[PDB]
């Protein structure tokens, strides 16, 4: 598990489940949403962006933009 | 079990007619006075060891006392 | 089953007490013809059913 | 991983045969049978979908050993009607009783 | 079992301090909170229960009493209704048109619910699966899978 943590034993010949089975696409999207939406909520509360640029970037985050 | 917060309230429980016995448990950081009443085991947690003998000698006479 | 009724448990009590062998002092009586208890029942060969 | 068993003869995962894992003072994880999740009273109006507030959400027979203040609020229709429909019925009772005066 | 909804209408007992709750065949258009009225002096509105004699001709009604006081027998299925064709004040008999096309001469005192039974257009959806037809009759009765008589034995 330390060699696999460094990337070993995880080549193409070691994969047996689908890429969506190993790492779910719905999970990777859910992780990205909480990451990008938390960034915008922190920039809005820190007055870095206003509620109009935030709401615009919120819908662009919901799209496959960033 | 009901925990008693004040020393005055503990004497009112030990002075009851259903108070069977009062146990004294000497722990490392405190001393507990566990009086056995009819329904609940009332316990007063005394922190400083100085008030232990102050409360031990103030118990009503005739009540069974046991040191653990 | 563990969940028994009083009548069934009382029925199993009578059938359990009858499963004894014949006492050997019966075979020494005058007109004795019984060699052994022919009504012995084993729990695995003959089921009560009742 | 110590696998544990039931503590009663009911061996089926019925609605009454619900348990939870608990650690005993003897360092043993045993089954502790839980009680059903009681629901708070619903509004007598039949309109508000939310439960009433200020009342314990316990089983019916548990209400027998609860104090009355733990089963109602200090309002007029408390414990039976929600605060929203009480304000509506207070206005509706007054406005209708006034219209029956105007028609005379 | 039925494709038409039922309305839980509440009334006041005219002789006791009691809340009488009835179960009507919900006419299409009624809603919760609506005041419906029953009697001969009630107005001609959808949901009201009126005698078939105290209504103008051509009135669309449902839950029509076949006999006076039977509490509604005719036109109680979803999307059906009965039309008051004509009257006869001499014999006190009204002629109504049933959903089957037949014209029946009933008494003028037979109450009925003005309007059309809700749930209309239910038969206009083609049941696509055999499982949907299973659930349809699973609540009605045990009659859905119909083996052909030619498939059986003599």
């Amino acid at each position: 598990t330390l060699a696999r943590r460094k990337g070993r034993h995880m080549g193409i010949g070691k994969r047996k489940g689908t890429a969506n089975a190993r790492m779910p696409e719905k999970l990777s999207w859910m992780r990205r949403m909480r990451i990008l939406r938390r960034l915008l909520r922190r920039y809005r509360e820190s007055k870095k962006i206003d509620r109009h640029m935030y709401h615009s970037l919120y819908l662009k985050v919901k799209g496959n933009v960033f | 079990p009901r925990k008693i917060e004040e020393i005055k309230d503990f004497l009112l429980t030990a002075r009851r007619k259903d108070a069977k016995s009062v146990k004294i448990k000497k722990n490392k950081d405190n001393v507990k006075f566990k009086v056995r009443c009819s329904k609940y085991l009332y316990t007063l947690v005394i922190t400083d060891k100085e008030k232990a003998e102050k409360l031990k000698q103030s118990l009503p006479p005739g009540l069974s006392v046991k040191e653990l | 089953s563990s969940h028994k009724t009083f009548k069934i448990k009382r029925f199993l009590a009578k059938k359990q007490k009858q499963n004894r062998p014949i006492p050997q002092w019966i075979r020494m009586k005058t007109g004795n013809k019984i060699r052994y208890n022919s009504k012995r029942r084993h729990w695995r060969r003959t089921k009560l059913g009742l | 991983a110590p696998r544990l068993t039931y503590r009663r003869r009911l061996s089926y995962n019925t609605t009454s045969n619900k348990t939870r894992l608990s650690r005993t003072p003897g360092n043993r994880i045993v089954y502790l049978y839980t009680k059903k999740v009681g629901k708070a009273p619903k509004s007598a109006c039949g309109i508000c979908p939310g439960r009433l507030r200020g009342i314990r959400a316990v089983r019916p027979k548990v209400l027998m050993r609860l104090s009355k203040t733990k089963k109602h609020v200090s309002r007029a229709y408390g414990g039976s009607m929600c605060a929203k429909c009480v304000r509506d019925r207070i206005k509706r009772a007054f406005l209708i009783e006034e219209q029956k005066i105007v028609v005379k | 079992g039925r494709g038409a909804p039922l309305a839980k209408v509440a009334f006041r007992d005219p002789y006791r301090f009691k809340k009488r709750t009835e179960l009507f065949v919900a006419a299409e258009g009624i809603h919760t909170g609506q005041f419906v009225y029953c009697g001969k002096k009630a107005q001609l509105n959808i949901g009201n229960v009126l005698p078939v004699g105290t209504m103008p001709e051509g009135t669309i009604v449902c839950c029509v009493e076949e006999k006076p006081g039977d509490r509604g027998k005719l036109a109680r299925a979803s999307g059906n209704y009965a039309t008051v064709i004509s009257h006869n004040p001499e014999t006190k008999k009204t002629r109504v048109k049933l959903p089957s096309g037949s014209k029946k001469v009933i008494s003028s005192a037979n109450r009925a619910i003005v309007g059309v039974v809700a749930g209309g257009g239910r038969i206009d959806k083609p049941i696509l699966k055999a499982g949907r037809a299973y659930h349809k009759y699973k609540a009605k009765r045990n009659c859905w899978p119909r083996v052909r008589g030619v498939a059986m034995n003599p």
Binding site: - | - | - | - | A26, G29, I30, H31, G121
Partner: protein, 91 residues
């Protein structure tokens, strides 16, 4: 965005039940699951609870309408016909 060409909502049935039958339910499966504007509250929350039952998730109004639509054409015609019979009856 356009995932299917013509089936749309009836794409769940795949290659089953026939093209005509999947086309007939399409007009009904859309109207059945469509949310209508509440005539009592104004919010577009009228949804079909059961056959002939239509409920608003905002004002908690339950309206007895059509099986697949909030109101059938035969109901709005009768409602207007009864209103015309009521006014001609009073006078």
């Amino acid at each position: 965005a356009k995932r299917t060409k013509k089936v749309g909502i009836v794409g769940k049935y795949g290659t089953r039940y026939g093209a005509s039958l999947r086309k007939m339910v399409k007009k009904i499966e859309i109207s059945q699951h469509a949310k209508y504007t509440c005539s009592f509250c104004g919010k577009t929350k009228m949804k079909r609870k059961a056959v002939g039952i239509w409920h608003c998730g905002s004002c908690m109004k339950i309206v007895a309408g059509g099986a697949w639509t909030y109101n059938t054409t035969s109901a709005v015609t009768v409602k207007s016909a009864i209103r015309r019979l009521k006014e001609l009856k009073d006078q």
